[PDB]
């Protein structure tokens, strides 16, 4: 229990060595905080690539969902970490996971205007036709947020 709390803390903080130690000492790779966040959620969100890799190799649940339905891939996409998007997909992240309002990682990448992440998601079979619970496709979101170049890429598919 204490190990699990420390693991959440260390993963969020980017403490590579501490994560290695806690995992070797039996910390639960899929520990949950009060919001349903796992160490993998926190590390992906905070851009901590080495920690993301370590956790995945220890069997982290790549598709764990927090209270708003974010998977680590949603957070990596939204926070603009291409390298983490890539590794999560490599380890089996669901490219089309849907959050509490039906947003997919492609919706969130379109929102923030990250073309490279959009391209990687598409390469891994992201659904351009996915509508969220507001009726919006990723292309709609891109246009709404002044990212015409992304809107055009998505509309050509």
């Amino acid at each position: 229990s204490d190990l699990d709390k420390k693991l959440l803390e260390a993963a969020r903080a980017g403490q590579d060595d501490e994560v290695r130690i806690l995992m070797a000492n039996g910390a639960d790779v899929n520990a949950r905080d009060s919001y349903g966040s796992t160490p993998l959620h926190l590390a992906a969100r905070e851009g901590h690539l080495e920690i993301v890799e370590v956790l995945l190799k220890y069997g982290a649940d790549v598709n764990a969902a927090d209270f708003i339905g974010d998977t680590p891939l949603h957070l990596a996409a939204y926070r603009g970490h291409l390298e983490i998007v890539e590794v999560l997909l490599k380890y089996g992240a669901d490219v089309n996971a849907s959050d509490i309002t039906g947003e997919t990682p492609l919706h969130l990448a379109a929102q923030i205007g990250h073309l490279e992440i959009v391209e990687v998601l598409l390469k891994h079979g992201a659904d351009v036709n996915a509508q969220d619970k507001f009726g919006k496709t990723p292309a709609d979101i891109a246009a709404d947020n002044g990212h015409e170049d992304i809107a055009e890429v998505l509309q050509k598919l």
């Binding site: 009060s34 919001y35 926070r79 969130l108």
Partner: protein, 97 residues
């Protein structure tokens, strides 16, 4: 109730409104968009303060009152959607955990 309980219940209710209540909300009432210079719960309470007797937003207002004890006019349906999106963004931005 813990901060995590406050947020979960508020988000769940906002999702419920966007999906299960027909727009326009509150007889076509208009409200000021949330003041981003203020605390989110208090700002949301303030935006909705002049809408009285709208059953759609009653539970939201009740919750916001408990969480706050101390640019454009928009329709209430838009306000609800914008608040929900803003809270999700704050959560994805590590402002709660």
């Amino acid at each position: 109730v813990p901060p995590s309980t406050a947020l979960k219940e508020l988000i769940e209710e906002l999702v419920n409104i966007t999906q299960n209540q027909k727009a326009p909300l509150c007889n076509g009432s208009m409200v000021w968009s949330i003041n981003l210079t203020a605390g989110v719960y208090c700002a949301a309470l303030e935006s909705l303060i002049n809408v009285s007797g709208c059953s759609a937003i009653e539970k939201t207002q009740r919750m916001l009152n408990g969480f706050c004890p101390h640019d454009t006019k928009i329709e209430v349906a838009q306000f609800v959607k914008d608040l929900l999106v803003h809270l999700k963004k704050l959560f994805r931005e590590g402002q709660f955990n």
